[PDB]
Design an enzyme around this catalytic site. Sequence first.
Site, mmCIF file in Angstrom:
data_model
loop_
_atom_site.group_PDB
_atom_site.id
_atom_site.type_symbol
_atom_site.label_atom_id
_atom_site.label_comp_id
_atom_site.label_asym_id
_atom_site.label_seq_id
_atom_site.Cartn_x
_atom_site.Cartn_y
_atom_site.Cartn_z
ATOM 1 N N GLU A 108 0.836 -1.197 0.000
ATOM 2 C CA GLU A 108 0.000 0.000 0.000
ATOM 3 C C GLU A 108 0.870 1.246 0.000
ATOM 4 O OE1 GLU A 108 -1.457 -2.911 1.424
ATOM 5 O OE2 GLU A 108 -2.440 -2.508 -0.502
ATOM 6 N N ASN A 131 -0.156 -8.330 -3.623
ATOM 7 C CA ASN A 131 -0.722 -7.534 -4.707
ATOM 8 C C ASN A 131 0.246 -6.509 -5.301
ATOM 9 O OD1 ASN A 131 -1.214 -6.139 -2.042
ATOM 10 N ND2 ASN A 131 -1.870 -4.505 -3.432
ATOM 11 N N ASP A 133 -7.080 -5.693 -5.485
ATOM 12 C CA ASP A 133 -6.296 -5.847 -4.259
ATOM 13 C C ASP A 133 -6.470 -7.256 -3.703
ATOM 14 O OD1 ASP A 133 -6.386 -4.617 -0.831
ATOM 15 O OD2 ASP A 133 -4.646 -5.202 -2.048
HETATM 16 O O1 LIG Z 1 0.540 -5.481 0.898
HETATM 17 C C1 LIG Z 1 0.988 -5.480 2.060
HETATM 18 O O2 LIG Z 1 2.204 -5.444 2.354
HETATM 19 C C2 LIG Z 1 -0.039 -5.544 3.187
HETATM 20 C C3 LIG Z 1 0.373 -5.865 4.481
HETATM 21 C C4 LIG Z 1 -0.574 -6.191 5.502
HETATM 22 C C5 LIG Z 1 -0.059 -6.474 6.913
HETATM 23 O O3 LIG Z 1 1.072 -6.022 7.199
HETATM 24 O O4 LIG Z 1 -0.742 -7.187 7.675
HETATM 25 C C6 LIG Z 1 -1.959 -6.179 5.131
HETATM 26 C C7 LIG Z 1 -2.258 -5.827 3.772
HETATM 27 N N1 LIG Z 1 -1.343 -5.514 2.840
HETATM 28 C C8 LIG Z 1 -3.652 -5.943 3.166
HETATM 29 O O5 LIG Z 1 -3.909 -5.549 2.039
HETATM 30 C C9 LIG Z 1 -4.822 -6.502 4.027
HETATM 31 O O6 LIG Z 1 -5.840 -6.804 3.471
HETATM 32 C C10 LIG Z 1 -4.461 -6.819 5.414
HETATM 33 C C11 LIG Z 1 -5.286 -7.285 6.456
HETATM 34 C C12 LIG Z 1 -4.485 -7.400 7.560
HETATM 35 C C13 LIG Z 1 -4.905 -8.015 8.876
HETATM 36 O O7 LIG Z 1 -3.995 -8.433 9.613
HETATM 37 O O8 LIG Z 1 -6.130 -8.100 9.129
HETATM 38 N N2 LIG Z 1 -3.202 -7.012 7.224
HETATM 39 C C14 LIG Z 1 -3.155 -6.665 5.928
HETATM 40 CA CA LIG Z 2 -1.895 -5.090 0.551
#
Ligand SMILES: O=C(O)c1cc(C(=O)O)c2c(n1)C(=O)C(=O)c1cc(C(=O)O)[nH]c1-2
Ligand SMILES: [Ca+2]
Lengths: 83, 83, 600, 600
Positions: free
Chosen positions: D177, D261, D303
């Site tokens: 992101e 993604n 995504d």
């Molecule tokens: O693309 C990334 O590096 C990244 C990292 C993380 C994270 O660090 O948990 C999430 C997401 N994206 C993401 O898109 C997402 O839906 C998400 C949900 C969560 C969670 O722990 O509920 N982390 C993340």
């Molecule tokens: Ca992500």
Amino acid sequence: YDGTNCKAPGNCWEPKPDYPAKVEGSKYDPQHDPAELSKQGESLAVMDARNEWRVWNMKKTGKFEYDVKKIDGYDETKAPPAE
Amino acid sequence: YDGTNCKAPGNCWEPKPDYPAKVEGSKYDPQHDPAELSKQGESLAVMDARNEWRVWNMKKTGKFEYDVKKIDGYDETKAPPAE
Amino acid sequence: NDQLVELAKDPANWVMTGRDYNAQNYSEMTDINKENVKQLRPAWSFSTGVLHGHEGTPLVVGDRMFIHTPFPNTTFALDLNEPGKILWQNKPKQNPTARTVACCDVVNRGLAYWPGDDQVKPLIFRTQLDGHIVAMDAETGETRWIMENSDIKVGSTLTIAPYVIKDLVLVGSSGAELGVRGYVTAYDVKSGEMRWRAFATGPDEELLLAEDFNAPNPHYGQKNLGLETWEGDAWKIGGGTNWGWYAYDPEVDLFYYGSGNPAPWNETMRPGDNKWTMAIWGREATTGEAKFAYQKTPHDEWDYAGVNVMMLSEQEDKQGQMRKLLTHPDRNGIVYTLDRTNGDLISADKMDDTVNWVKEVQLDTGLPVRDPEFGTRMDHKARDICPSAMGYHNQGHDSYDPERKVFMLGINHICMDWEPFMLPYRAGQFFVGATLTMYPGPKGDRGNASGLGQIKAYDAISGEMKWEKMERFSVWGGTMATAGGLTFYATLDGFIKARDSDTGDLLWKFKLPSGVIGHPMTYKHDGRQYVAIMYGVGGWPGVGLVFDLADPTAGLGSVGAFKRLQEFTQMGGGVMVFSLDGESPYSDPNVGEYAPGEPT
Amino acid sequence: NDQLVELAKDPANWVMTGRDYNAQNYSEMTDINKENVKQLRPAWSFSTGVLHGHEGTPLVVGDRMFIHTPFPNTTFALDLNEPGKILWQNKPKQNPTARTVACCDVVNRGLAYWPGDDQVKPLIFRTQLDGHIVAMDAETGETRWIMENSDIKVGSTLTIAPYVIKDLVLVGSSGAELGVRGYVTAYDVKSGEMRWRAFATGPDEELLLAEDFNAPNPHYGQKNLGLETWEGDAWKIGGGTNWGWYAYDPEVDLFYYGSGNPAPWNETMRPGDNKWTMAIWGREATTGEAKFAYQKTPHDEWDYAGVNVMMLSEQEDKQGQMRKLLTHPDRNGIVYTLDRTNGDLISADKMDDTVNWVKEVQLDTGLPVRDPEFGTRMDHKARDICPSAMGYHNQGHDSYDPERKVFMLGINHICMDWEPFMLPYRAGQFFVGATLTMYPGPKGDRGNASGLGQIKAYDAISGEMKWEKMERFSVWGGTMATAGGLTFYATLDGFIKARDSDTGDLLWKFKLPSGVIGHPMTYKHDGRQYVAIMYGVGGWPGVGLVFDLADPTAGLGSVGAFKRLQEFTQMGGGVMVFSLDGESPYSDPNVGEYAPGEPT
Ligand SMILES: O=C(O)c1cc(C(=O)O)c2c(n1)C(=O)C(=O)c1cc(C(=O)O)[nH]c1-2
Ligand SMILES: [Ca+2]
Ligand SMILES: O=C(O)c1cc(C(=O)O)c2c(n1)C(=O)C(=O)c1cc(C(=O)O)[nH]c1-2
Ligand SMILES: [Ca+2]
């Protein structure tokens, strides 16, 4: 100073050996600025004042309002209308 | 664009109706600043750099130190001693 | 309030802090007893969404449990029919600066309930750290009114639980460590309009005394002692705040409470008995006038803030007559018992033989014979004084078993080194002026900083200890006794224990998520007896843990005494509920499950 | 690691994320089964002392239980002989600026364990949000070494759990992101020295491909695709970060994981298949060189980060050929099954018929036939896309039952409205580029915002759904299956439930302090089987509650979809353990009691 030699009912304090009977003047004189000792009382005064307005406004309006600034007719220097 | 029309194996992207085949020079050109696009790589280089001395110092001393500034023989612009 | 006493007669509710006006934390229920306490299990739980000290206990009224929280003090309302749903939550907005003038963690001791009449439905009351007292509809939780009681600009905060009597809600005060002059205030439950306010020091017109104040015991002191016992204007900043608990006798219409310590801690800066700090009060409820007052600690020298629990009982005299009493385990190490209609001193025993600041209390004069060797004074460092500033008993709300006629006291075993120092008074800044070093008492393990607590069953008349038990840490959250012959309480190291009231044996326990500093509570719902308790270590004992400190003298000298605590618990927050075999509305899995319908 | 596959053979240990390298979250124990399950009660609990989302699951190795936590990521170690004691804790000092570049709460998914050898003692590994990977002595919790893996200055953080294979520990990556180019790095468990590193985009050399990459399935793509499926240098901030889970077959010495993604979310800004984002990887554990890779979602537009769980199994084809498999339930709403040695695409079904961005996945070509009505693009607001950006399946680590040959899947039922927008890339700043509105799928209640989860038993080969059950909230934390015919999982509204693995019926549930987002685990200790789980709502679905958000599009669009979550839970943090009749070491009240002196 064992707490049993009272100058009168409810008054039994005595200075410990070598200590002053009066701090004023001694080396343990607190020297409290009067301006400071008054902050508290002044504070209660202004709060109580604001509360009167809060109480008055809910009674006249029917709804409650905490922010005196939004009370119709609020005057910082006067008390609510004698009604 | 259904994703089936593959230009070659493992490459099947096709512009959606009314969109360029190349964004550069279009109203969608991101116009990324190369100086910005290179920061990530520069960052990994410095970390790996520092990490090298952390691995070396621990082998040569038997103790582990994180703050490179506290390693004997450390130099920002130079790799660890071949030992 | 008559309806409140009426509601208390039903084991279904727990309408106020000590369950009822006698403040005994006693339940007539026997469903849970010595025989079956071994099968006591967790029925359900609820996290508060906030860390820091979780003191006090939840209130239960019908199918609803009310839960208060430490800063920002948001109040919750749970549906007992299915504790999973949160009926409502009132979350205020406060100036985070209020956290700055809190001496001993951002704790809050409880809520209060007004039964409502034919004009205004039931109301829940809460006090906020920032000084506000607020009323909210019990059904919806929407705010009815808010009034300012304490200004944080002068280090004046609120942590005490509001208390309801008739049509008044009482609000205490905190801040003696900041030099705040103590005062209690009464507001009308409906409008929040102030009906009266009474201070703990100064002129008798601010002290609010009855025409015949201390008439039965003239020697206690009477008129003009609010000025006379202080040198100059020192009383304008002489503490006396009441942040402890209340008790009330509707028969004679008198409520009782204790005034705090005088400011500053430096005793050399304030000559005199500093009245009326450290006193037990008997005040007319409707008017607020004091009928009697007894100063337990004249010219304090150890911060033995006298705000502790007030437990009412009707026991037989030492001369064989039924007397209306009031028992009070003070911070100074003495457990006082008085004729709650006179102020008559009946008993004044040491909760532990190790108390050394006093040799003894004379019941005829009421004066404590100080032992000069253990007082504090400028240019001198007193050592091994017991109790310490944290006292042999702190804020914990204890209990009384009317059947066995014993008090279940949660005791602390801490002593200290103390040296005062000169310092100026600046409104809003701290006004302590003393450096401490606390540690376990002679009966503890000073070597390893352990054995800092005790629990005992005390008999006010004979002054005898039926049984005593040593606890690893100070039992800081109070206790609760039941007709089942059990005495519940919780520890700072994470457990809720159940002991035999007659023997003091450990019959059961559970490892909760975090240490405890609130008192146990019990109510009956759907013919089942539940026992709930809050967990979330904090308060004075946990400042070191809570604020990550290392200097042993830091935290007013508490950090040292409790450096080992962190090896047994971390911060937490929530309420844990128990029942026999963990029986709850969810024993039937389907209860609560999602059904397309409408908002669950 | 060999002794690691060994310890895994003993039901007393849970040495890694999915217990063993097959990552099935399956238990061979039967003590707890379809019969006694209703007598499951809490044995003890522990509070982490911190708030926010608590993902992952605790690791047990003999007489010790290790616990990881959200920022500051401090690690704990408990003595299973008496859980009330904290053997050791390691609390790091991190720059709070790290919280600033975290997209979706400051979570952490787990620890890793290295059995140690004749040279160095067993080690516990953790990842920190600030990008450090660290090793600690599993007996004292003393730090051995710490290496810098990610730089928060460019928006690169760490949330994934470390992973141990042989004498290496794998570290993933987070930050898409924020436009972070994904990469997995391996270090020596002893020296912490970097062995290799493979990126997910760019040149084949950085991608680290094996000399015969994809030889078995050339149609998947082969050389230079990480440079040709992008225009210019777009791949330098392409993403593909892997923050999910791993699987490992020591037989073929290959580990598996899914790449995230592509950045940004604005698809129009990055034309091309965008390889190798959204792919399933098969790499050599010793070199990191890829043997095969399949891109599930070329040119992402929703995504559908492809980092979900990798569950290994050995089943039989439809042609009767015994195959070493790998099942993978992806965010795009498709559950994939490939030959973990080959790369062959055996199965690729829809976890639910509402998925509409794809028509179907041609098993021959291996391509997802897209449906233009549900793709996204500049100057267009697409409506009703399923799954939503949160996907029909997220980080939850699910389970597989070998005997019943099914997969217990914790599913989300969320669709969305999507609208992209142009924006510059600025190292360290968010690089999303899309406004979303999420809501309940067609099978849920969109009016009342309820019904966003499902639990289904899925057969890979037949592609059948043995049983389906609807949850009011997205079952977000994974599941666990046991030989006793039970499948445990916890919900966001604060419950830990157990369903009949054959009929999907609800046999039991307990109301925990807070909602759950981590997966349950089980272990045998002192001859008793326990079921531990972590509670403390947070993560993406909770960002609105954790950060106090009111705008429905805020929280990347998650706020509006979970606006009701607040009525069932508040924040929290800790672990709760269960057993039949909640028996535990403390069933003997006197265990762990204050026993000073030399008893004996
Ligand atoms: O693309 C990334 O590096 C990244 C990292 C993380 C994270 O660090 O948990 C999430 C997401 N994206 C993401 O898109 C997402 O839906 C998400 C949900 C969560 C969670 O722990 O509920 N982390 C993340
Ligand atoms: Ca992500
Ligand atoms: O001077 C005061 O008004 C005042 C207030 C409070 C409070 O409100 O918490 C405490 C104290 N003093 C105090 O001396 C003390 O030992 C103490 C312990 C605690 C606690 O909650 O554990 N509060 C307080
Ligand atoms: Ca005090």
